[PDB]
């Protein structure tokens, strides 16, 4: 729709160097006085070790970024995370640890390249990827402190880079695991808040509940999940991990993680729910059409139903196949051409009935008045779901979604913020009213934003009283190569900017730390 | 959304009497001078024979209506169609022929109650329902002329009340039939235009092509189908006719047509295409989620794809179960309550790829640039489809759709007109831009319109240069009980009205005859 023939988006994938200390950003407009804190973000910063390239978008070495709002000025800083992967790569001047889509050549050494997200646990902050290894970091200085191996504390093989954090600091996550059956399963991990004893909360990790797997030996790729005050929602997609293949290519040949994925063509999507407080899996066989899922938007309870809002990609093909660096660095026509056969992005609201009566076999159970979502109870005992579409644009994804999480996560809500992807290229920011379907767009030419993070006005009365923060890469004609953008959350109108004189590569997720 | 607590919609289902001759309507505003012709419509007019009621909406005895535009004035007329059903009912003072949802009590006597539609064949016009019996009628006087039995001329058991008529007067339809396999199938019937020989074209009926059936002994209920210059599209829904049951309740007990229907829970929807010119069925196994379908909107070819736009109801339950007269005559709260578990209406665009390559197995084949519809080729050879949603409102159907059929039927187009159903109650008229999704609504309180028919301006330059005609029932405070509505097709703004002093019951379909 919008076109980027100048190819500026290639700057999102160009290596940068870390800083020794914070730069001072040149500020435009007016930073709100109540914005005092830090925006922390993780993404790849190093896309080749020497003349050895990294191939996939999720392979480049973790880079930790900070935009600080101190006493009426803004600074920018960045430091590579000192991971085994990074350290060993630097020691030995080559690629040492196999990344998601790049096999290294000379037990199994699983990557700790924490390029995806960062989150609070007790008084600590950890950078993560999606394996068992998270990296404790210093949120003031950006120094690496420690590697943690979650297998030491709990039985999981890995965990998402999207834990849910409750208001009391309790942390919930999900990862696959070995069941007692000698099957695969998915385990919900709970890390408690910092208690009086003042001991590291990770040492108090425990399993809340286990979800079954649709296939005994293949778990689905899980990127995120849903949490309400009373329920956990997990979506099992037809993107499957063939564990066999990476335990056959380690031994004999030589593979990466991407090589294990296969698509199951016939299962579609299975949706699973567990009672959070009683810690039981509920046996409701929710089923629907096939789609990839990376990001839940929000989840909530409305009478005897769960409302589940999702960023979907229609299809069973793995959308990550489209995310190799060569693909993303082609020119504009080839980018558009290459995405023509990709899965098509769509925001969807599914409605899952909680209180199932066989009396209603063969009818639509969704009796709520303001939705077009359906759930049908088959004789089978299967519950077949159709969504209400909330947003749909040709090869235009509303993605990397965020909400006013602190007051509205897990509860009834109205607004969602997101990054607009145009044939996979990030080129706009969106706001979406999920009840009316109104949208708002912020966009400028040759400008490539990141996930918008929302920060509440401390005296907020409405759900969107606050701002949205995005890191924007604007290559071009003598342009400030990048800047931090602050929008008014009500109408996505610009409030301010903090410009810098250096490039910033793609970042995925992060948080705003009030301090 | 809008509420009708006064219950005025019950007047759509109250018996009326025919007229001896045309009333003269009181006209408001300005009838366009180029509107000279006749609006003909069919619907039920008689909902009980004495103290024997008819139960279903599709059971009342056919009533033929005419609004005439002659020399700067408007008339209204109506005559019951003199069918076997009607005539015998009147002769014998009771219900004689079993209707769709009303069994009569004292070979098989199939109904010819032609309450659904009327269409041109050569220089003739026939009222129809969905059986093998159509009734030739006089379009000037509304007199019944003749019963026709299509089994005499072609091998079908019945035919839809939605034939497609080409610009040269050729008529296409579809009905189920016995295959040579001793299976069920669906046959495409072609009736040619009136030729030089001047013989009745029905005598020249022939079979073009046959579609297979998903179930050997159960055909799906078919209400309509798609036609482009090169293709025929047929949609096989999980609403199935159990022929066995009506050939077991005729012999032993005593049933109606509605009693034969069952829903197939596992098949979903199968979509079928045939080459119109070569008269071959194409073996592409299009499949998708379950839905009822009554009305195609329009179909067309866009490069190597068919665009299929449909008024869907999500679910496999038969929507006709909600359409008994008692249900429709309850009060407003009970109407809303009763539809809470019904299938949910949605307008959908499916995109069917024509040129299938196994090289693209597991990918999305829909490479067109302005749609979010997908089609995925499974290993199976199955092609799994997801729609682009064009309109979706909670228990608000865009239904009884019409287009500028003469210039745009079967071809690329932009606008569709429709009747808005609010928990099954007709209470608005809509226009829909199918590319942008903009809508327009005409609505007034305690007013219940019928299917909007579109008539082109004779000097039309754009697709919506013309008017839309609807019959509106407005019961109320000393109100003209009904009127004919003429809207401007561009913005659904009112141009005129032709009021009458008598009630008019529900009508389904019809045509505008330029004369
Ligand atoms: Fe993510
Ligand atoms: Fe119809
Ligand atoms: Ir302020
Ligand atoms: Ir005019």
XYZ file of N, CA and C and ligand atoms in Angstrom, chain B residues 116 130 161-162 223-224 294-295 320 400 451 508-509, ligand 2:
40
model
N -41.898 -17.875 -3.647
C -40.517 -17.486 -3.452
C -39.992 -16.468 -4.460
N -39.221 -24.211 -4.889
C -37.970 -24.962 -5.049
C -38.196 -26.412 -5.447
N -35.231 -21.480 -6.691
C -35.935 -20.280 -7.052
C -34.959 -19.152 -7.410
N -33.700 -19.496 -7.686
C -32.684 -18.508 -8.069
C -31.935 -18.846 -9.323
N -29.935 -23.523 -2.416
C -30.843 -22.399 -2.594
C -30.450 -21.521 -3.737
N -29.154 -21.447 -4.044
C -28.660 -20.627 -5.133
C -27.263 -21.056 -5.556
N -27.647 -19.364 1.771
C -28.818 -19.202 0.930
C -28.508 -18.426 -0.321
N -27.822 -17.300 -0.179
C -27.652 -16.381 -1.301
C -26.251 -16.050 -1.666
N -33.285 -22.517 8.935
C -34.744 -22.542 8.777
C -35.466 -22.986 10.046
N -30.702 -11.228 1.515
C -31.473 -10.948 0.299
C -30.712 -10.002 -0.596
N -36.559 -7.159 0.351
C -35.383 -7.168 -0.501
C -35.349 -5.930 -1.376
N -40.374 -12.218 -0.587
C -38.986 -12.683 -0.616
C -38.187 -12.107 -1.770
N -38.588 -12.436 -2.982
C -37.839 -12.046 -4.138
C -38.745 -11.529 -5.196
Fe -33.724 -16.708 -1.781
